[PDB]
Amino acid sequence: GKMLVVYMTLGYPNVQSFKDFIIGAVENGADILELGIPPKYAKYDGPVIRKSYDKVKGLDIWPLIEDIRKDVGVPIIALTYLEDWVDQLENFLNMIKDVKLDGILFPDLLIDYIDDLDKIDGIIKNKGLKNVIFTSPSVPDLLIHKVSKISDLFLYYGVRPTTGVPIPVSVKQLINRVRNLVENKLIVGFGLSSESDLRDALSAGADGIAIGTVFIEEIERNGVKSAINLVKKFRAILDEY
Ligand SMILES: [Cl-]
Numbered sequence: 001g002k003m004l005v006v007y008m009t010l011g012y013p014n015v016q017s018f019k020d021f022i023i024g025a026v027e028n029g030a031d032i033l034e035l036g037i038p039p040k041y042a043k044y045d046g047p048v049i050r051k052s053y054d055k056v057k058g059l060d061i062w063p064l065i066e067d068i069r070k071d072v073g074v075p076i077i078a079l080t081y082l083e084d085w086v087d088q089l090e091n092f093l094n095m096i097k098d099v100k101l102d103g104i105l106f107p108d109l110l111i112d113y114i115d116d117l118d119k120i121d122g123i124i125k126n127k128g129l130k131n132v133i134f135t136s137p138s139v140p141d142l143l144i145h146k147v148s149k150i151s152d153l154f155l156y157y158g159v160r161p162t163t164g165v166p167i168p169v170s171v172k173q174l175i176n177r178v179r180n181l182v183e184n185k186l187i188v189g190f191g192l193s194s195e196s197d198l199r200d201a202l203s204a205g206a207d208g209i210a211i212g213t214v215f216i217e218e219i220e221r222n223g224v225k226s227a228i229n230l231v232k233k234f235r236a237i238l239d240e241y
Contacts, residue, residue, distance in 0.1 A: 007212025029235030103130025
């Protein structure tokens, strides 16, 4: 079947409500968790991700990661910029394995560290960790093909960002043009998540979808239990395929 990947900003909105959402999300069918590590600097994050980072400013991040690791048994991927840890890439990857997370996803890996790709994949893989590689429409087709054969768990393909203007092309067509390039499992991630966009990706052959900002929005406007119920809804939609 199809994989439901659920993102949440570590500690958002508060520590107790964050664990409630994660546990509820996993109970309602999340297959993979992505946890957003608040960034040491500003980068390619949109308005609603940034505001989620604002509300957990100064969070003690490692005890919470440890804590949530004890609470749920699904694969957990750390979402953080290779930027914030390239100075210290060794004590980061050891800490990640120390607290028992399954892998990482560096969004800026293929952008700002493309020449370091093969070294960094090698080190991650020889720590037993998963290197989940981020791609997007601006990643050239042959690079996408390259990383599709090395990406662990799945290759991630991000469309519909909250920042900027979306590509005025149907998600069905966008995924049609990468599905045959990706030998891996293909997870399509969304900033804006219309149901039409999600069904377009699944019907175009994506092996799952990743969603996150939709949950941050639903929490702020209707609360954690409402956001948990959205997970149930997305699970049912993926279960139609
Ligand atoms: Cl797009």
